[PDB]
Amino acid sequence: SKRNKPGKATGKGKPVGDKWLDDAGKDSGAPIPDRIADKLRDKEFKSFDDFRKAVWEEVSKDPELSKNLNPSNKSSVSKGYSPFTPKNQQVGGRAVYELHHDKPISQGGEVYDMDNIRVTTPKRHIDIHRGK
Amino acid sequence: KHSISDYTEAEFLQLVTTICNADTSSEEELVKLVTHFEEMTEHPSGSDLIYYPKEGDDDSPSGIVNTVKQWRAANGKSGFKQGLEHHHHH
């Protein structure tokens, strides 16, 4: 398991705006915001889950990216937890925004390449997953 | 524990405040408490009561307790166990 080993974050991410998380329910999900990639680039993480926590914490520190989160969701991301999506975008017990890889690891997609990571709602991810 | 009538309003306020402040040691634990909250309230909006309040709804802990209390009252469902106030004096 490569996602459970240490690695270094790389990549540019993409400029996103206001309702960046609203895009997480459409298309291939939202990209990692450029400012978050700027903060995590060249840092070493112990696992993908360690990277995932840093993403949400960096989100909590970014006034533009976190301003559309309500106070309860802001408390969550400040602890490095994924923010809850709207109920109608959850799937069973999957209630929070997810980080997934665009090109799968088995095909050469890199674990910590921030341009290969997308943010999805559980609902969008299951749709993508079912069409494979 | 088993249904919302097992909570006094104060215990339910402590539960909601726990959730709102993300007073847990893991995301797993917070997600479990949110699910438990949904199961207690029986509200069709589930976690949206906490994270995606309806425009003009009070999303403070006390706000959310109130919204639950009132929605249950209006839909003919059971409410909170009465609390037993501690009195320091006769």
Side-chain angles (χ1 to χ4, degrees), chain A residues 1-18 20-42 44-132, chain B residues 1-54 56-90:
Chain A
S1 183
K2 214 166 61 193
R3 71 193 302 124
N4 289 341
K5 302 185 186 319
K8 192 195 80 167
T10 51
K12 294 64 205 88
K14 296 274 259 296
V16 306
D18 254 332
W20 81 282
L21 292 173
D22 300 343
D23 288 332
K26 321 176 89 287
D27 298 333
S28 293
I32 293 296
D34 48 6
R35 295 192 300 277
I36 297 318
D38 289 342
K39 287 286 198 177
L40 301 185
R41 173 206 303 122
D42 290 333
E44 181 177 308
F45 298 88
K46 56 185 22 26
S47 65
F48 187 66
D49 185 53
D50 190 48
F51 167 84
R52 172 193 285 118
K53 286 159 178 26
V55 171
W56 296 123
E57 282 162 344
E58 291 311 306
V59 168
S60 88
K61 293 166 206 192
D62 189 293
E64 285 303 307
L65 296 171
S66 62
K67 86 180 178 220
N68 216 219
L69 258 10
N70 92 329
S72 293
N73 254 334
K74 284 186 157 92
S75 291
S76 194
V77 299
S78 78
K79 299 228 174 175
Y81 304 163
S82 320
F84 289 81
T85 70
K87 185 173 156 168
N88 65 12
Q89 292 293 311
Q90 309 177 8
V91 172
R94 294 162 62 183
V96 296
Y97 288 98
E98 303 182 347
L99 301 198
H100 297 279
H101 291 81
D102 196 349
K103 175 177 207 183
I105 275 70
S106 64
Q107 288 291 113
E110 297 169 16
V111 173
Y112 302 103
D113 168 7
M114 303 187 277
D115 297 315
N116 193 38
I117 296 164
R118 311 230 65 150
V119 189
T120 64
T121 59
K123 181 190 195 187
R124 183 56 180 180
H125 185 255
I126 203 142
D127 283 344
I128 296 168
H129 175 89
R130 285 165 182 177
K132 284 162 188 165
Chain B
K1 73 166 78 294
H2 303 131
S3 78
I4 206 182
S5 68
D6 289 324
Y7 281 88
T8 65
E9 187 170 340
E11 286 173 301
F12 199 76
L13 178 67
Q14 288 286 325
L15 170 62
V16 174
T17 300
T18 293
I19 289 164
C20 285
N21 291 343
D23 286 339
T24 67
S25 52
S26 71
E27 177 186 305
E28 195 177 355
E29 181 195 348
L30 181 60
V31 172
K32 291 174 191 159
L33 283 178
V34 168
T35 295
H36 176 240
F37 166 90
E38 300 180 320
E39 289 174 12
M40 295 305 94
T41 69
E42 299 182 289
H43 197 109
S45 313
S47 63
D48 288 350
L49 290 188
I50 296 163
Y51 292 105
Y52 293 91
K54 171 186 198 71
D57 277 347
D58 173 0
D59 67 357
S60 64
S62 283
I64 291 153
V65 172
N66 231 298
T67 296
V68 167
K69 186 169 186 188
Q70 291 173 162
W71 176 95
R72 293 189 61 87
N75 293 262
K77 303 192 181 300
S78 63
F80 297 117
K81 196 190 281 165
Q82 188 180 115
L84 202 154
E85 181 193 349
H86 185 256
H87 288 109
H88 293 100
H89 296 104
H90 285 110

